[PDB]
Copies of this chain bind each other. A is one copy, B any other.
Amino acid sequence: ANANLFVSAENSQFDNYMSGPQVIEVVVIDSDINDTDEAKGEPDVTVNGKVLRMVQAVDGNWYGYFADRDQAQIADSTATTADSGLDFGVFCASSSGTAALGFSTTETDGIAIPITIANATATGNGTQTGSSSGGAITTTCAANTLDASTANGTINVVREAKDPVAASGSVSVGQIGLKNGTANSGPNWPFIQLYELNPTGNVVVQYNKGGGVQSTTLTFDTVDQFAELSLDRTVFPRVSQVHATITDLWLNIDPTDEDSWTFATNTKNTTSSFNVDTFYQVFDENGASGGSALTLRTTLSSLMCEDNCVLTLDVDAQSSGTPVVTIQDNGDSILTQLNASSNTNANNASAFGISTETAKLGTGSIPVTITEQGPNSGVFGTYDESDKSVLKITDNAKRGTSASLDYNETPQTILVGF
């Protein structure tokens, strides 16, 4: 295998597939270029032949974040508000890298920088939200675009980028000339370089160094065949927790942090306005408020999802009046009892909702939340780090009454017995 090139998608468990709008991180760990006090040369790395500018961090490793241009634009379209949802920041053309970042990026299809626009002109300033249907990037950016920003660090798909090397002596910021080197709240780092990729086609990342080229092969294909949900036990006793494990590649958008998804799985909420929807990063990995909740139901088709990005739950399959599974708050989410009336108890799964986002996650609309088991493992679990699950079996359950939890359009039945 490779010894100096590490790509986020090198996973033999999932056959090195990459899909959706996920950002793929490329890391170079070489002994020849990891001196942070010297102006050593940038590693010559190429994805499908096109160069990929690397920024060195305080650990002496060179980092480059890339994603598909159309997928990133589609994902940013749903990010109606800055720094929330699948927010890629501001799209600037390839020719604007020198003025916006301080170095040439003409070989890439586009760059997404973490700024905000305060004077949204037609040509001189980039696009804040990006086209819904994707397409080519033409809008440019400049130094006044950086200086006029009222807020910096609007990218939410790469949240834990390492700190760039500070300028000292002959060494510039990142050894390539960044203008502002703040790790995540700045207007330059991190930045995603956009490459228009071939669907169902191989993606090859190559690193050039003296001794031999190192190449990694990746596939740009739908990953519905690798997605499945597994229950820990066949039969659930009365008070047992319901730990659910979800393994899916498309949900691993962030290559450097734990991805968190909050769902609306209640399949019987027959209100016309309500729809079964998936939400990205409502609760951070720490269990705090990750931002606002934003719609993703009408977009998953364009986000290359093939029946593997939506979760649906039914608390009672037999409609016996006693729900089987319920939901509960834990350390990875903020779930509160909206209907605090004494007439109902915690056993009512429809009585729990998210207070700050009651517009689509109020009473009813059973909010199921999953967190990633590691920054890049791609395996998600309802249970928190304290073995306390989101889904719980009701205490007054009846033997034989069962609940249906559905993922990947392959529902699994949660049976109750003794």
**Which residues of chain A have a CB within 8 Å of any CB of chain B?**
1, 3-4, 6, 27, 29-44, 46, 48-51, 56-61, 63, 70, 94, 103-104, 106-107, 109, 135-136, 138, 160, 162-163, 166, 168-171, 176-177, 183-184, 196-204, 206, 208-213, 215, 256-258, 284-288, 331-332, 371, 374-377, 384-388
Q: Is the CB of B27 within 8 A of A41?
A: no
- Would A332 and B162 count as touching, CB distance under 8 A? no
25 contacting pairs across A/B (C-beta < 8 A): A31-B210, A32-B34, A35-B39, A36-B39, A38-B58, A39-B168, A41-B59, A41-B61, A41-B163, A42-B59, A44-B59, A46-B286, A46-B375, A48-B331, A49-B284, A50-B286, A61-B208, A94-B286, A103-B163, A104-B184, A136-B331, A162-B210, A166-B170, A170-B171, A201-B385
Nearest-neighbor residue (CB-CB) of A3 within chain B: B211
A33 CA to B210 CA, complexed, in Å: 11
A184 to B44, CA, bound (A): 12
**Residue on B with the closest CB to A47?**
B385
The contact of A197 among B171, B287, B385, by CB within 8 Å, is B385
Q: Are B204 and A385 in contact (CB under 8 A)?
A: yes
Q: A39 is contacted by which of B44, B166, B371 (Cβ under 8 Å)?
A: B166
Say yes or no: B163 contacts A40, CB within 8 Å.
yes
Asked whether, in the complex, the Cβ of B136 is within 8 Å of the Cβ of A44, the reply is no
* B331 engages A196 (CB within 8 Å): yes
Q: Which of A3, A106, A163, A377 has the most CB of B within 10 A?
A: A163
Residue of A34, A59, A169, A258 ringed by the most chain B CB atoms within 10 A: A59
Apart from A31-B33, A48-B386, A136-B286: 7 A-B pairs, beta carbons within 8 A: A46-B375, A48-B331, A63-B210, A107-B286, A200-B387, A201-B385, A213-B374
Tally of this chain's copies = 4
Residue numbers in B under 8 Å from A50 (CB-CB): 286-287, 375
> What are the residues of chain B within 8 A of A104 when measuring CB–CB?
162-163, 183-184
Set B70, B169, B374: member contacting A170, Cβ < 8 A: B169
Taking the nearest CB of chain B, how far is it from the CB of A400, in angstroms? Answer: 30
CA distance A203 to B386 in the complex (A): 7
Q: How far is the CA of A415 from the CA of B190 in the complex (A)?
A: 51
Closest beta carbon of chain B to A329's beta carbon, Å: 12
Among A32, A183, A286, which residue has the most Cβ atoms of chain B within 10 A? A286
CA of A43 to CA of B200 in the docked complex: distance in angstroms?
37
Question: Are B44 and A29 in contact, CB atoms less than 8 angstroms apart?
Answer: yes
**Which 3 interchain pairs have the tightest Cβ spacing?**
A41-B60, A41-B163, A201-B386
Report yes or no: A59 in contact with B35, Cβ–Cβ below 8 A: no
CA gap between A285 and B277 in the complex, in Å? 38
A171 → B minimal CB distance (Å):
7
Closest to A159 in B: B106
Chain B residues positioned under 8 Å from A202 (CB to CB): 385-387
Closest beta carbon of chain B to A119's beta carbon, Å: 25
Residue of B nearest to A44 (CB): B59
